[PDB]
Subunit: 283 residues, 4 copies
């Protein structure tokens, strides 16, 4: 159950191969973070032994995240989804990760053009119920990330995520919020935190344009005050799309640079967020 | 246990004589509030039975507030402070009030030019302990309002108010915050609410210039989100200095109109605050 | 050029057919707005005489907006775009509208999957240059609306929109910003207004979730102070998708109600916005 | 005249004695600011030639500010006030300072208990007109700082400061705003900047509790967007009362530490403010 400050390793690696894992872990140490979030674009290819050894040796905690590929979108292909999640759960457990989070209930790019249906939600609950069983067997939790309306039409708000967790009735699925998505979806950004308060264990601290935290439109004081007020003790994960590989960036609608360089994003954004977390007593 | 929305009657009445009480109660009904806060500038002159019958007839709840006059400033004249507060506490209870709140520990205009001393605080604590016993005997609570540095040098922040409540050791003293004061004093406005969370039962929703809520510098989204997040269930009291009698106005450094007219303040401010309360789930 | 307060008619009707025009115009008058913004999504279907009669009878001004259908996306099918824009311009002018604005350079839901290219912009400029000549012939101006990265890949910021206006070199194209889009795209919302100031004549005061203004994440105090500071004097227009025009639903991505109903958005959002304009002393208030 | 970033020297010393100036100038160069604001609260104690030598060898600009002592409040004792200002003006000029700003029209802590009267403003205008001519004699400008209702009852807003400037009619008096004070007095912080835009040459970027900028309640994005929008090009100065000059402690009301220490305020506040000025494209950053 993640605690403290971490970073999504997108800024150094989206391909978690051997040199990529090395590079990301090194950056994590340079910035003195408490954990890393490992994107698993291709869970089969991950060398669990190498990553486990790296995390243990540097006393770094980790969790993993993914989005389901189209061949495995839970809403329409629930059997493939369960298969894909079971592989990723095993990989996360093996490398020492404490959770698999993200868009584990569908894909980036899902859109029917109409509101989400009970049939879609039924398939998703089937998938999550099975994956949660499997995750319990490996000693990890699952995280359901609310993302904005353009990426997925099924779970966009903290309240929708909580409704899905109530539908599944498991005890090892938590809510994962992202300030970039909440900046679009939440009716006042604090309401996403309020609505998920009983299940919120992880939040991406990401600026409104995916650039440098502190230098966009996210309401950071409301965000941090509300996290402190609900007693949030989970993971604070800085995320920025700076230096993302072009192929991955284009898929997430990055048509232009989100910030100047890593020096700008990490050198201004990370102190901003740590200072805010101290200011409001999260630490 | 004050609940819901109310108004400080200074917008219609600072002199709580018979016609003043009638006028304020009439306004309260028009704006459909749940309670009124009655300023008690001259507690001996209050007709308790008239006001009690007005409140019971109109299903309206009430609390009273005051600041201590200089002859009874608790920090330096605690015996006179106790005598003054007993009179106000009895009048408050006799009229049907549920609490006496405000600057019950000192006065507007206290300033030594140096930090508050332990001797000052010892005198305040003795006064408030005697007052709390007297209040307990009449079935009411006391509220300690944090006010800004220019009005009083002793209790300016939520954390300072809680400290005094802990020094006193009574269980019937609560913290009373005011967004106008917090806008100056709190290191991020939500931190006053967070620091006071265990004892917070009343908040003045006042704009940064004492004018129209919604049209100043107060961070309303952070305020309401943090209230909701700490589970606040006490009194939400609108306060504006519009139409205050000039003698009282000048005493609080109102050197110019805070707003056009009551129509602006109540017509724009009260909907703004009620809409925010609904937005963040306080209602 | 538009002044005062207005409303995008999705507040009141899905389509600009005859009963939709009757309903929207009646609602607009109830709220004492100065103008309405009418979607030009099915030009051959618009009964221009019926709408112009309604507008002139009730002393309501209007402009139109659209997104281009994929058959006529300017970036890839510029000749189809020109023809489509000429029809939309003529219908806009025939009903008495004073400008045609919005995503007039592409689709709502347009994306190639890669960043925008010079070849795409070269085509858009050709299209807008031809369209702006046609608009001038009918006495109306054109507006280019910056929309967020998920709705179009070509013009997302005030500075991009201004670069397109500079690339075209016309005298009758303005910039149209939208607080909902700037909430995503601008590095500090005021920056979109600053970057666009020389050409900004129309702004959608749309809440961050397309809901009720004042009850989302938009930085309204920053928005209004910056509009006042640059001396904005064009149209202030609400946009809340209480009703969703079918031809743009897929791209606008409203999958759940933006608010309880039109009464809530108009009854709470419009007074908030009018009160903010007065607070910051906006020209015309 | 003043450009770029600067710091009120209460950041580093309580008094402007010889050792205090050693320290402040040293710090100012550690943080690579462009200027310092020196309190002229104790003129007979200021070694002007020593400070002036430090400023030139360290390539550092300066201005001074003050509040008037009660014996010389321009409101009630105008002839005293003129004499006090001429001395403060002369010593400011002697040490290399380019303006004398602040509460030059009254006391920090001045109040009558009643709203300001026309007689009071008459006296202030007479004082400032006299003072302004003496200031021109020495080649420096005067600044009128709006402060909050609890520190002075006469000039609390941008608009009031402009009205006093327009009354005096002098070419060499600017408006000085302070975000700490505007946080209380302005009905929307950007309105103070808007109202003062024709005369605004200096702003204190001071947090709402006089602590670390970025970590209080000031609406920084609105502040910086509005400064960019009006084309602000004057001094951007920090003010945090780590140290408190004794002459003004009673009126400034710092009864507890504003922040952990100077390292926290400068180490977190200055990068925040520099980053914001760049974010909004402020002239010179
Ligand atoms: O804000 C937008 C695009 O997201 C709309 O203004 C669009 O141009 C309009 O709906 C067409 O009528
Ligand atoms: O902001 C203020 C007044 O509160 C100060 O700038 C004051 O004028 C200065 O301390 C005098 O040097
Ligand atoms: Mg995320
Ligand atoms: Mg109060
Ligand atoms: Mg729009
Ligand atoms: Mg100042």
């Amino acid at each position: 159950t993640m605690q403290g400050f971490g970073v999504h390793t997108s800024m150094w690696t989206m391909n978690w191969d051997r040199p990529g894992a090395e590079r990301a872990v090194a950056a994590a140490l340079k910035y003195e973070v408490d954990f890393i979030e490992i994107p698993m674009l291709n869970p089969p290819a991950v060398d669990t032994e190498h990553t486990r050894a790296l995390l243990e040796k540097n006393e770094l905690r980790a969790l993993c995240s993914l989005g389901l590929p189209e061949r495995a979108w839970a809403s329409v292909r629930p059997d493939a989804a369960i298969e894909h999640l079971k592989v990723a759960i095993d990989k996360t457990a093996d490398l020492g990760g404490e959770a698999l989070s993200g868009v584990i209930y569908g894909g980036i790019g899902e859109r029917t053009g109409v509101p989400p249906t009970e049939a879609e939600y039924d398939n998703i609950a089937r998938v999550l119920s099975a994956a949660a069983k499997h995750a319990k067997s490996r000693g990890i939790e699952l995280g359901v990330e609310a993302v904005n309306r353009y990426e997925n039409h099924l779970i966009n708000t903290g309240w929708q995520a909580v409704q899905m967790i109530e539908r599944v009735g498991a005890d090892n699925i938590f809510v994962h919020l992202d300030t970039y998505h909440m900046n679009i979806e939440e009716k006042g950004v604090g309401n996403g935190i309020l609505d998920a308060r009983e299940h919120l264990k992880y939040i991406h601290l990401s600026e409104s344009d995916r650039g440098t935290p502190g230098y966009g439109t996210c309401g950071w004081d409301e965000i941090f005050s509300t996290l402190a007020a609900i007693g949030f003790k989970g993971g604070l994960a800085m995320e920025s799309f700076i230096n993302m590989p072009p192929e991955v960036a284009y898929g997430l609608a990055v048509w232009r640079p989100v910030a100047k360089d890593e020096e700008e994003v990490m050198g201004n954004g990370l102190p901003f967020l740590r200072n805010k977390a101290k200011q409001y007593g999260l630490i």
